[PDB]
Ligand binder design. Structure first.
Ligand SMILES: COc1ccc(-n2c(SCCCN3C(=O)c4cccc5cccc(c45)C3=O)nnc2-c2ccncc2)cc1
Ligand SMILES: [Zn+2]
Length: 208
């Protein structure tokens, strides 16, 4: 029961999402192997995701987390990257399929850095690249990220050297302990704690 509302480039809501999309690009330590080499995106379209059942699922779980955390859901707007955003905008997030392990264990991954989410669009470590050119840095094929509303509540703070929640926590925060430039990543283990608000269709742009 999902509806997609295409946003005009003139809409204030379109510009504030693209802005967040463009300004959260950062240099990547891996030399762009996973997500490709680029400094900015070409936004082809942004779509608002509306689904009543999914929203109720989210707000319901949000109320429970909030009451377990001094009335603080600790809600963020985070980017999500994976090759399943097509099923997700219809079926919503589902922790049952989130068994693939990452840097911070298994679970559903989000990031403040859009370019970090871009790394996982075509699979873990970029997979084998786009289905058509097998190029992880393809400048032609379309990519899709979700700009989601996520509930973090009491989040366990994990530091890196750069599946259920920890007892008494509703999520996990992944933070670099030396590179203060890389923004945080987040992992949740309840599909109900994330709602995909926006669908961003884009291409990475080849630097000049
Ligand atoms: C294929 O390579 C990947 C790429 C991204 C993920 N992933 C995922 S997959 C997307 C979330 C889980 N999930 C699904 O994986 C999923 C797959 C197929 C159909 C679905 C229908 C509804 C809901 C889902 C799904 C769903 O919720 N979440 N975090 C990661 C991740 C990101 C970065 N590092 C580690 C894990 C897992 C595997
Ligand atoms: Zn391609």
């Amino acid at each position: 029961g999902t509806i997609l509302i295409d946003l005009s480039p003139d809409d204030k809501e379109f510009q504030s999402v693209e802005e967040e999309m463009q300004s959260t690009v950062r240099e990547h330590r891996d030399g762009g192997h996973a997500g490709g080499i680029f400094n900015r995106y070409n936004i082809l379209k942004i779509q608002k995701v509306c689904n009543k059942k999914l929203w109720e699922r989210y707000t319901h779980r949000r109320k429970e987390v909030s009451e377990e955390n001094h009335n603080h859901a600790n809600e963020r707007m985070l980017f999500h990257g994976s090759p399943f955003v097509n099923a997700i905008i219809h079926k919503g997030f589902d922790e049952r399929h989130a068994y693939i392990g990452g840097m911070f264990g298994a679970g559903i991954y989000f990031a403040e850095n859009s370019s970090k989410s871009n790394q996982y669009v075509y699979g873990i470590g970029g997979g084998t690249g786009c289905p058509v050119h097998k190029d992880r840095s393809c400048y032609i094929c379309h990519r899709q990220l979700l700009f989601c509303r996520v509930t973090l509540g009491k989040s366990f703070l994990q530091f890196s050297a750069m599946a259920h929640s920890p007892p008494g926590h509703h999520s996990v925060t992944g933070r670099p302990s030396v590179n203060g430039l890389a923004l945080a990543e987040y992992v949740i283990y309840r599909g109900e704690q994330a709602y995909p608000e926006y669908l961003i269709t884009y291409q990475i742009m080849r630097p000049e």
